[PDB]
Structures are given as structure tokens and as C-alpha cells.
Design goal:
part of a larger assembly, 8 chains, A mainly alpha (about 90), B mainly alpha (about 100), C mainly alpha (about 110), D mainly alpha (about 80), B: about 100 residues, mainly alpha, Histone, subunit A, 4 helices, about 5% strand, extended, D: mainly alpha, 3 helices, 3 strands, about 55% helix, nuclear protein, Nucleosome, DNA binding proteins
């Protein structure tokens, strides 16, 4: 009747990318759904507060980059920032 | 002649067993009745989805486990092995819950 | 009329850029959402999911099971320092705890 | 039926098992009343917020999402029940 | 820019008719009013968003106050809010 | 003929409504929300300032300085719970020494 | 310059906290703790500043760096 | 000569410092420490004066809270003198 949206299949595809021969139960899928939503809410909320401090009114990529710098601690910061920059560059070149 | 472990070994066997498993440790019905009893203090005639009570129980068990880990650290700090009510009160007071 | 290809295909991402953009627009995070922000955000989410899933898969391999279960996710999260710091407060349902006994408890 | 004095439902061996999970080896005898008090206080704190959220939406059912949100407010996020 | 200095001063005169307030304390009270306002508005936002609604009526503010404020402060503040809204609406 | 005058409040209802609109807290802001919010803010400020005025007269001064606010905040259970994580500039601490440290 | 946190200063800080007798290894430990905390505040302050394309770390950036970690600071707002 | 038994001067200092509120770290050493730490992230940073004031207030309040919790730990173990193990335990329990 009423559709429900979740990141189940995308998590599955990423899992196949990293480990070609491993399945994952339903409850682990529930945890990964909730985790992806949690991280997304943290990052977007932080970017919103940041873009509101500077009296701007638009979440450009720069805000997401700074929010990822703030939230993710340590090596994850550098790796995630590199991934973001690579994705944006490959997106814009086409 | 009878088999009777020294006090201390059965505790370690239980510690290994309960750190290797994941099932819930509080019986379901007593906890459900406790939850309903507390809820009736605020607004009467409330109904609880079963998943909601399960989530509440998971949160309570995780909280108590964390509390006992920190309390055990406090007790070992005082060069003891027993945990005592002052240990729990100190752990909570440092955590900022009181 | 052209053969439309999904933005996730353009950006080389698995995560759905359309869905992330839709969430940003409907979540009232800001008035106007840039076109690069959903792409960047989807890339970061994909990287974090890949990290956790790789570690969990390794931990599941170590104890000879071939399917990831919440105990494995707990073991993967708590055994990596940086992931532990990011997810310090979060309580995993059906998660258990790390096998760990204080030394002074064990007999001398 | 009016439900009273169910706090005794948290049996002593239950608290024993809980501590055994946490790495505790020797438990005092007065731990039991103190732990029951702590658990009662924590449950009151969670259920107050859960009931508040529920009353706001004009419902008489405390869904799992209300409890997940009430926990999310107190800094203990719960993964796995969000749906 | 804009702050709540004069309003805090008026309230202070209303409760303690013969007391003054220094500059730094006024700065602290400005920050405190902004802080509580941000907490309450944020809770109203989250709450109106959970119910898939879109409008922060008085009800959402009432529930957000019930959530953030602890103990008898909640009851007193809720009484104040309801009385103020009623007086505004009927007049 | 101001909304604050209508509601018998002291805080500005108009500025609070403007803030709710400008902060992106929701798409639409109801009419009674700013009034309720201003009333709540007024009551909380009145509570803090009444306690601080009492604590100021309790040490023989007629002006409030941040030490007084720290005393009033930390000496009341509910307000202390509300502001549990907040550091007040120029505050010091509540005078409190553990009983064991005291001689005899 | 971390040796700038003079031993009498740490003694005074302890005196404020209700401490009565202080060990001797405490001073190096406190310097280490202070170094860690100052790093974790200044990192966020500098990140906020780098974002707005400024070379001056204003006061609001430090207030926000604290406000993220849960230690709200009043009096400089701003 | 006239000389207090150890412990009483500590109590007089305790009351004196819990009565007043001025800063307990000399300003210039702290300012140079702040600049040294920030020198590794951005090279040409100029701090507003009030920013350094706020940084110092936050650091003092954090350390005072830390020593309060450490003192509770120390009294717990039937001692009166704090030790690095006390501070390490306090930080471990607090969540760091």
C-alpha cells in the first residue's frame, strides 16, 4: 500500500563491491539503514548550522566538505574529503 | 572428593559465557509489567507496541552494562574486587547523571 | 529525449544522488541546495558504509561465519579506534560487548 | 488491574547476569536495591519523553519510533529499531 | 546589532524594583535567552517534522517546552504560555 | 497596540516571530507560537533574575555580576539540571569542600 | 611553550577545584591533558575560520568550536 | 618561628580561591601556547583578543571540572593526594 524508502539495496551493492562472497542478514541491514540515516542527519545538520553562521543561504559543496572535516575524526577526515573531491570533479567533467 | 570449584572460577566461566552471547538477560514479562506500571503514572490507558517495549528493554540492558563496566573500573581503582553501592554512586556522579 | 543516465552513474557512485538531493530539499536544512552538495554527500556516505562493511566482513571471516550479523558489526565498530570515536555513544541492538576481562580480576 | 510493586520483577539473578556481562566478578549484597533504583529512574526519564511525543501526535499507542526518539534525545542513539 | 538588553532590564525592574545589572551580566543574559530560544525552536522543528506536519503552532512549542524544561519549571512555563496565548486571542 | 502589549508580555513578540521565520525552523509559523515562545522566555528570565537578586541581597550588594548568576544557577536543582553543561564566564564555583578533607 | 603553564598555576587550578594535596607527577599529566584539549578546540575554531575565508580567528568561532563539543560558553556571544 | 602545620595553608588557599573568580593562568604564557598550537594548522592566523580570552576561560573551567572529578576519585580510594592514575580514571569514565 504505502511505500517505504530505505538504503537496503545500495548497501547490498557496496557489500558486493568490497566482499564478493558475503551475505548479510535482515537485522544487519536494519542497522546499516539506521546508520546511514544517522550519519546523513549529522552531516546535513552541521552543514546547515555552518551555512547559517556565515549568513549564506545555500549548502554548496564547500559546506559539506567543512562539515565532514568537523564530524569525522582522524584518517576518516582525509579519506572522506578525498573521496568527495574526486566525486565532484568526475561529476563536473562530464 | 566432591567436585567443587574454588570460589572464583565459576564466576570467570559465567563471564566468558555471557560476554560471548547476545541474548537478552532480563525476563520479558516482569520488565513489560514494570514498563506499564511506570507509564500509568503519567497518562492512564496507554498501549505499547511490542517492538517499543523491546527497544526499551534493549536500552535498559545496554545502560546497565555500561554502568557496571564503569563501576567495576571504579572498584578496581580502590584496590578491591567487590563492587559496592558507593562504587555505583561514584560512577554515576562522575558521569554527570547526578 | 536523450538516453538519460542516473547521476550516480555520472559521478561513479553507488549511492543514489537523487534521493540524497531530495532529502536535503525536503528536510529544511537550507533554502537552496547546491548541485554539488548531494554528490559530495553521497560519496562520503558510500565511503563510510564501505569502511564499516569491509571491517565487519573481515570480523565475520575471522570467526568462520559467512554472513554478517549485528554481533559482527559491533565487533567491527568497537575494534577500530576512529570508527569507535565517530560512533562513541551509539548503542547497537543485539550487539553484545567486546570480549575483555580486567587483568587484576584474573588470579595472580 | 492496577499494577503496583512490579519493580521486584527485576530479579536478583537478572542483575547478577547483567553484571557478569560487564566484567564484574564479585558483587556486594546491597547492589541490588541501588541498581533497582537506578533502573527505575532511567526508565522514568525515557518513558516521560516517549509518552510526551505520543501525546503530541494525539495517539494512544507508544510506538517504537517514539522510544527511539526519546533515547536519541538523551544522547544514547539506538540503531536497529528505526524501521 | 540587536539584542534583548532592554527587555531583560524591564523584567528585572518588574521583579526587583531597586536592583541594577552590570554590563557583563547583561551579556550573559543575552546569551542565555538566545540559547534557550535556539533549544526550543530546534525541538519544535524536529517535532513538527516527525509528524510530517509543516507548521509550528503553539502546540509544538508547548510540547518542546515540556521536553526540554525539567520538573516544576515545565508546569509553570506551560501555565504561563497557555495564559498568555489565551489573553492574546480573546483580546 | 503591539502584540507584546496584547499578550501582556514584556519580551518582543515581533522579534521572536521574525527569528522563527528567518532561522528556517519550519515552512510556516503559526500565529500563537511567537506569543507562547515569548511568554516562556520571559518566565525563564524572570526565574533566573529573581534567584540572582535574592543571592545578591544575601551578600550585601545592589548589583548583579556573573558570580551572582553562577550562585543562583548552581544553587537550584531544576535550573542546574537545565544548564548542566554551560560554562559561565567569570563564574568561579560553588563553595564546597569535601567533609573528609575538613580537619577532625 | 607548553612549559608556560607554570607549576604554581596548576597548583592554583587544583586549589580551586577543592583539592588538598597534589602529587608530583600530576603536573606533566595536566600539561598533556591541556595540550590535548586545546588541540581539540583550536582545530574546530580554525576549521570554522578557514571556511569563511578569514585570517582572523574571531570570538564567535571559538564559541562555536566549544558549542559543538557540549561545553557551551556564555558571555562572549555575540 | 610561627609556622602552620601542613594542611591549614591549603585550606586557607582553598577558601580564598573558591571565593574569587579572576583568571588562574598568566595571560601571556597562555597566549603564546595558543599561537604555538594553532601554528600547525594555519600559518598566518591572527587571533582576536577576546577569542583568546574565551579560549582561556574554557580551558580553566574544563580543568577545574577535571580536578573536581579527580578529587572525588582520590577520596574514593581512601587517599587525600591525587595521582595521575586518578586523573586517568576520571577521564576514562567521563567518556574520553
Amino acid at each position: 500500500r504505502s511505500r517505504k524508502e530505505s538504503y537496503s539495496i545500495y548497501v547490498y551493492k557496496v557489500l558486493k563491491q568490497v566482499h564478493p562472497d558475503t551475505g548479510i542478514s535482515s537485522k544487519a541491514m536494519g542497522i546499516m539503514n539506521s546508520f546511514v540515516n544517522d550519519i546523513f542527519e549529522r552531516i546535513a545538520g552541521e552543514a546547515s548550522r555552518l551555512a547559517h553562521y556565515n549568513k549564506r543561504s545555500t549548502i554548496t559543496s564547500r559546506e559539506i566538505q567543512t562539515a565532514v572535516r568537523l564530524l569525522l575524526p582522524g584518517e576518516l577526515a582525509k579519506h572522506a574529503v578525498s573521496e568527495g573531491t574526486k566525486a565532484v570533479t568526475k561529476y563536473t567533467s562530464a | 572428593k566432591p567436585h567443587r570449584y574454588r570460589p572464583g572460577t565459576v564466576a570467570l566461566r559465567e563471564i566468558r559465557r555471557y560476554q560471548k552471547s547476545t541474548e537478552l538477560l532480563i525476563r520479558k514479562l516482569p520488565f513489560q509489567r514494570l514498563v506499564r506500571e511506570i507509564a500509568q503514572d503519567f497518562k492512564t490507558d496507554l498501549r505499547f507496541q511490542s517492538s517499543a517495549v523491546m527497544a526499551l528493554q534493549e536500552a535498559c540492558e545496554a545502560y546497565l552494562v555500561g554502568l557496571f563496566e564503569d563501576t567495576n573500573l571504579c572498584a578496581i581503582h580502590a584496590k578491591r574486587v567487590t563492587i559496592m553501592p558507593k562504587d555505583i554512586q561514584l560512577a554515576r556522579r562522575i558521569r554527570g547523571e547526578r | 529525449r536523450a538516453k538519460a543516465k542516473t547521476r550516480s552513474s555520472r559521478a561513479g557512485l553507488q549511492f543514489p544522488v537523487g534521493r540524497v538531493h531530495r532529502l536535503l530539499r525536503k528536510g529544511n536544512y537550507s533554502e537552496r541546495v547546491g548541485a554539488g552538495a548531494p554528490v559530495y554527500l553521497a560519496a562520503v556516505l558510500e565511503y563510510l558504509t564501505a569502511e564499516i562493511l569491509e571491517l565487519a566482513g573481515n570480523a565475520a571471516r575471522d570467526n568462520k561465519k559467512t554472513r554478517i550479523i549485528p554481533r559482527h558489526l559491533q565487533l567491527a565498530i568497537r575494534n577500530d579506534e576512529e570508527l569507535n570515536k565517530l560512533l562513541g555513544r551509539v548503542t547497537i541492538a543485539q550487539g553484545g560487548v567486546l570480549p575483555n576481562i580486567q587483568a587484576v580480576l584474573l588470579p595472580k | 488491574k492496577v499494577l503496583r510493586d512490579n519493580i521486584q520483577g527485576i530479579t536478583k539473578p537478572a542483575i547478577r547476569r547483567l553484571a557478569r556481562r560487564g566484567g564484574v566478578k564479585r558483587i556486594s549484597g546491597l547492589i541490588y536495591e541501588e541498581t533497582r533504583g537506578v533502573l527505575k529512574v532511567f526508565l522514568e526519564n525515557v518513558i516521560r519523553d516517549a509518552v510526551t511525543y505520543t501525546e503530541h501526535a494525539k495517539r494512544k499507542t507508544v510506538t517504537a519510533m517514539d522510544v527511539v526518539y526519546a533515547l536519541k534525545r538523551q544522547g544514547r542513539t539506538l540503531y536497529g529499531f528505526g524501521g
